[PDB]
């Protein structure tokens, strides 16, 4: 995992810094960012009204 | 005194009024009378104002009748008035049928 | 005293990507400048896109045309993505008539920008794959706007039993940068580097958009500094 | 609030300050050792506990 | 709308309140401001499962509720479908905003 | 259309605190305008204050002087609260001397308005308790600056190791806060309300600080927008 993350040009640790739109502040602790797989379930609220 | 309606938080009514629940009811009565008097006043004077014509279109011809209507519509509901009367505590409650200090 | 900068430099690697640098600055002040610019740039600019479609031989968003490899849904969905450009001012709204009638693969630039008022930037996008024999007639409406609008609001324009309204993403910007770092002389401080990047669609060079954002922001502060009406 | 608002002190550092608290239940004002922060919240604890 | 004078018939008022065309929600903003509403849980265990509140407009089709009150409802945010009620009588609304 | 806020309001509770209203804002503009004005008003101000003093009869920093009820530390702290002002331009740096030799509560108004270019407003501010039995003579150094300066920094200004130097709160604005609110327009919600509160030292009305700050920021975008200006 670490070898691939290295060879992709990334922080070898999964962490990074981040910024806020509105204040430009650098969130003093490093936040985690990534890519994940995501599903939508069938309880759509249009039929709960 | 202006109210600018909010939600009320009370212990003062335990000072002037002996019981919470009786306090609620007497506020209810005062609110009732205040509402009745305002509703009759509004209905009489407005029907006098619009006695000339009652059609759908004709009511909006000057925008000022609507303006006064929404001004009074900008006034707090009766219960707020009665509550404010008890923080000012201008009223006194006693055995059945307590009434304002209007005399 | 007020350490005023004068160094505003442009470098412009391409017609669409540009850099800018601001030099020299008083501390803690460029972050303010740049973050204000980033917000306004990336929020509130103006662009164009397509809204309405009338296909011949199809009546609703779930049909299919004989001899065309995609649904009508995917035609509309990818037509959503085609970024445009003006060549003339004052072009309000436009209607187009495409008649593809040959054994082809129907692509973006294949759209004849046949109206003199307007053009297409991205020409090399694949709308659809026809067969050897499909005949297709399409009619477009392109219009200007801001931010984002969904479909059902665009139900305003008179479907006439055929017209299909589509989503429309109007924003003309794609990416923005600012960064800051100190620069110094020995023993004497308070030099600041602001380095900024603008990446657009090509519908307008970075300079015009940057100028417009600043014009709006100054237009806001103008009233809020001088006029002082009192309660 | 001034020294924090100009980054000369972070949100958090042991500082010594002159503050008022009631000894049952009065009115002692001494030099406590505390931190901006605790000051910010204790701006909101009502002036009847200390 | 009646006290506006612009409308004389409840049929017209219903016609205008149903299709909800570009006319005033100002009345909803006003009335919503002194006419509290009773929020109602389904499996009420002890009274702290029924309350009143001052209601507020928001965007969309969901009920926004303050984070620190739910523990009274002893609920979770899985997606439950809380009920709401409107009193209609001023004695009731006073009991609401005085004890509820 | 794009909807402008007009006629900023202020409530003016007193000469040291004030409140501000901005109506109506379009979304996201709340944080922008607010944060810009905040950092500007907290960014670029000016002032004068005490730097280093020497007290007669003092062995070193924390001896105890008889005849005065208040220790050295508390005297230092009280002088930190003395607020200055100028009547003559360019009188950047000043020195003075004070002698008191009678039974009195030494106050701020008792200070010898001897050096003509300089005044004190908060006259009734109390310094210390004094009787017949003690006499005090001391030296004042008053210097211009910006911000908040720790004890180490100002030792450059004539330290000499027997004149004890002190911090100086040069900043004329003491605290400013703000808030953002939602509110309505027909068909819609989520338009912004910006609420401001300002608390100064009394040397200047807060409306003046705000007006001047916003004028700075306008003059500062003008150049980074239009160094190479067209239209």
Q: Which residues of E touch F189 (CB under 8 A)?
A: 57-59
The structure was resolved experimentally with cryo-EM
* Rounded Cα distance, B61 and B49, in Å: 13
- What token pair was written down for F73? 């530390």
Candidates C38, C41, C217, partner chain F, best to mutate (most F CBs within 10 A): C217
* Rounded Cα distance, E91 and C10, in Å: 71
Beta-carbon-side half-sphere exposure of residue F11 (alpha carbons within 13 Å): 11
Cα F46 to Cα F63, F95, F162, F204, distances in angstroms: 34, 19, 28, 12
Interface touch E59/F187, C-beta < 8 Å: no
* Binding-face residues of F in 168-197 toward E, CB within 8 A: 184, 186-187, 189-190
* Rounded Cα distance, F26 and F42, in Å: 25
Interface touch F189/E59, C-beta < 8 Å: yes
Q: Minimal Cα distance from F147: which residue of D?
A: D6
* Rounded Cα distance, B100 and B79, in Å: 15
- What token pair was written down for F57? 């009869």
Residue E58 forms contact with F (CB below 8 Å): yes
The subunits that touch chain B, with at least 3 C-beta pairs less than 8 Å apart, are E
Q: Are strands D15-23 and D26-34 parallel, antiparallel or unpaired?
A: antiparallel
Scan for tokens 């000016």, then name that residue.
Answer: F46
Give me the phi and psi of C83, to 5 degrees please: -90, 145
Contact C37, C210 (CB under 8 A): yes
Q: Which residues of A touch E81 (CB under 8 A)?
A: 48
Contact C192, C25 (CB under 8 A): yes
Q: Please, what is the end-to-end C-alpha distance for chain E in angstroms? A: 30
Question: What are the E-state strand segments in chain D?
Answer: 15-23, 26-34
The subunits that touch chain A, with at least 3 C-beta pairs less than 8 Å apart, are C, E, F
The subunits that touch chain D, with at least 3 C-beta pairs less than 8 Å apart, are F
F178: helix, strand or coil: strand
Interface touch C228/F8, C-beta < 8 Å: yes
Give me the phi and psi of C230, to 5 degrees please: -120, 150
Which residues, 6 or more positions from B37, have their beta carbon under 8 angstroms from its beta carbon? none
* Rounded Cα distance, C56 and A41, in Å: 37
* Rounded Cα distance, B29 and F12, in Å: 41
Residue of B24, B74, B78 lying closest to E95 (CB–CB): B24
DSSP code for B77: P
* Rounded Cα distance, E67 and C231, in Å: 37
Counted across chains C and F, CB pairs separated by less than 8 A come out at 95
Q: Which residues of C touch F9 (CB under 8 A)?
A: 229-231
How many of the other CB atoms lie within 10 Å of CB of C180? 19
Q: Which residues of F touch C226 (CB under 8 A)?
A: 211, 215
- Write out the DSSP string of chain C: ------EEEE--SSSSEEEEEEE---TT-HHHHHHHHHHHHHHS-EEEEEEEEEETT--STT---TTBSS-HHHHHHHHTT--EEESSTT--EEEEEEEE-SS-EEESTTS---STTEEES----EEEEB-SS--EEEEEEEEEEESEE-TGGGGGS--TTT-EE--EE---EEEEEEEEEEEEETTEEEEEEEEEEEEE-SSS-HHHHHHHHHHHHHHHHHHHHS-----
- What token pair was written down for F65? 């002087």
Task: List, as own/partner pairs, every contact residues B36-40 make where C-beta atoms lie below 8 angstroms and the sequence separation is at least 24, other chains included.
Answer: B38/B78
Interface touch E57/F190, C-beta < 8 Å: no
Which residues, 6 or more positions from F117, have their beta carbon under 8 angstroms from its beta carbon? F86, F87, F88, F91, F94
* Rounded Cα distance, C214 and C209, in Å: 9
Nearest to C97 by CA among C127, C142, C66: C142
Interface touch E58/F184, C-beta < 8 Å: no
Largest CA distance in chain D: 37
Contact C93, C49 (CB under 8 A): no
Cis peptide before C24 (omega within 30 of 0): yes
Cα F69 to Cα F72, F103, F111, distances in angstroms: 10, 12, 19
Q: Which residues of F touch A19 (CB under 8 A)?
A: none
Q: Are strands C136-146 and C46-55 parallel, antiparallel or unpaired?
A: antiparallel
DSSP code for A46: G
Q: Are strands F84-86 and F118-120 parallel, antiparallel or unpaired?
A: antiparallel
Scan for tokens 């270019």, then name that residue.
Answer: F117
Contact D20, F162 (CB under 8 A): no
Q: Minimal Cα distance from F174: which residue of D?
A: D2
Candidates C3, C25, C32, C43, partner chain F, best to mutate (most F CBs within 10 A): C32
* Residue F200 CA to its chain's centroid (Å): 7
* Rounded Cα distance, C213 and F32, in Å: 13
* Rounded Cα distance, F11 and F91, in Å: 36
* Rounded Cα distance, C68 and C55, in Å: 13
Nearest to C80 by CA among C164, C203, C182, C202: C164
* Secondary-structure percent of chain F, ordered helix, strand, coil, rounded to 5: 20, 35, 45
Interface touch D1/F171, C-beta < 8 Å: no
Interface touch F228/C8, C-beta < 8 Å: yes
Sign, CA torsion A26/A29/A35/A38: negative
The alpha carbon of residue F174 is apart from the nearest alpha carbon of chain D, in Å, by 7
Q: Per residue in E60-89, is it b (16+ CB within 10 Å) or e — as a string?
A: eeeeeeeeeeeeebebeeeeeeeeeeebee
Residue E30 forms contact with F (CB below 8 Å): no
Q: Minimal Cα distance from E56: which residue of F?
A: F183
Contact F93, F59 (CB under 8 A): no
Cα E95 to Cα B12, B79, E66, E82, F104, distances in angstroms: 17, 11, 22, 22, 63
* Rounded Cα distance, B4 and F83, in Å: 41
The alpha carbon of residue F117 is apart from the nearest alpha carbon of chain C, in Å, by 21
How many of the other CB atoms lie within 10 Å of CB of E6? 19
Q: Could you tell me the resolution of this structure in angstroms?
A: 3.5
Nearest to C69 by CA among C112, C105, C111, C110: C105
Question: What are the E-state strand segments in chain E?
Answer: 37-40, 50-53, 83-85
* Rounded Cα distance, B69 and B72, in Å: 5
* Rounded Cα distance, B21 and B27, in Å: 10
- What token pair was written down for F13? 């509770």
Q: Are strands C7-10 and A31-32 parallel, antiparallel or unpaired?
A: unpaired
């Amino acid at each position: 995992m670490n070898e691939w993350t290295d060879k992709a040009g990334l922080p070898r640790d999964g962490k990074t810094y981040l910024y806020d739109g509105g204040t430009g502040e650098r969130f003093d602790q490093p936040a985690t960012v990534g890519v994940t797989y995501f599903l939508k379930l069938g309880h759509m609220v249009d039929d709960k009204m | 005194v202006p109210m600018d309606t909010i939600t009320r938080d009370m212990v003062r009514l335990s000072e002037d009024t002996e019981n919470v629940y009786e306090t609620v009811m007497i506020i209810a009565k005062r609110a009732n009378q205040i509402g009745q008097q305002m509703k009759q006043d509004l209905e009489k004077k407005l029907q006098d104002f619009s006695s000339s014509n009652d059609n759908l279109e004709e009511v909006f011809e000057n925008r000022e009748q609507i303006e006064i209507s929404r001004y009074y519509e900008h006034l707090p509901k009766p219960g707020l008035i009665a509550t404010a009367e008890y923080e000012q505590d201008k009223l006194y409650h006693r055995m059945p049928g307590a009434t304002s200090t209007n005399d | 005293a007020f350490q005023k900068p004068e160094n505003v430099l442009m470098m412009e690697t391409s017609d669409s990507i540009a850099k800018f640098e601001f030099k020299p600055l008083e501390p803690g002040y460029g972050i303010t400048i740049g973050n204000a610019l980033r917000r306004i740039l990336l929020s509130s600019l103006e662009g164009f896109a397509i809204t309405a479609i009338k296909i011949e031989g199809v009546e609703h968003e779930f049909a299919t045309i004989p001899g065309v490899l995609e649904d009508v849904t995917n035609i509309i969905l990818n037509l959503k993505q085609v970024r445009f450009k003006q060549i003339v001012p004052n072009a309000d709204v436009e209607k187009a008539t495409i008649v593809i009638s040959n054994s082809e693969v129907f692509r973006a630039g294949d759209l004849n920008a046949q109206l003199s008022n307007f053009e297409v930037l991205n020409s090399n996008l694949v709308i659809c794959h026809l067969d050897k024999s499909a005949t297709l007639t399409m009619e477009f409406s392109i219009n200007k706007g801001r931010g984002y609008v969904s479909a059902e609001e665009n139900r305003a324009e008179h479907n006439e039993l055929s017209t299909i309204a589509i989503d429309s993403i109007y924003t003309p910007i794609r990416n923005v940068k600012y960064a800051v770092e100190n620069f110094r002389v020995e023993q004497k401080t308070d030099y600041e580097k602001l380095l900024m990047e603008v990446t657009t669609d090509g519908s307008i060079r970075p300079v015009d958009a940057l100028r417009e954002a600043a014009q709006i922001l100054i237009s806001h502060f103008s009233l809020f500094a001088e006029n002082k009406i009192a309660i | 609030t001034i020294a924090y608002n100009e980054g000369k002190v972070d949100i958090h550092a042991p500082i010594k300050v002159y503050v008022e608290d009631y000894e049952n239940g009065e009115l002692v004002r001494r030099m406590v050792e505390t931190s901006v922060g605790r000051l910010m919240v204790n701006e909101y604890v009502p002036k009847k506990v200390g | 709308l009646i006290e506006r004078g612009i409308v004389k018939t409840v049929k017209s008022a219903k016609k205008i309140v149903d299709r909800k065309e570009p006319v005033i929600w100002d009345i909803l903003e006003y009335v919503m401001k002194g006419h509290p509403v009773l929020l109602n849980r389904a499996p009420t265990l002890h009274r702290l499962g029924i309350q009143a509140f001052q209601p507020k407009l928001i965007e969309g089709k969901a009920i926004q509720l303050h984070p620190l009150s739910c523990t009274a409802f002893n609920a979770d945010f899985d997606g439950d479908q809380m009920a709401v009620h409107l009193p209609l009588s001023n004695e009731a609304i006073l009991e609401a905003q005085l004890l509820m």
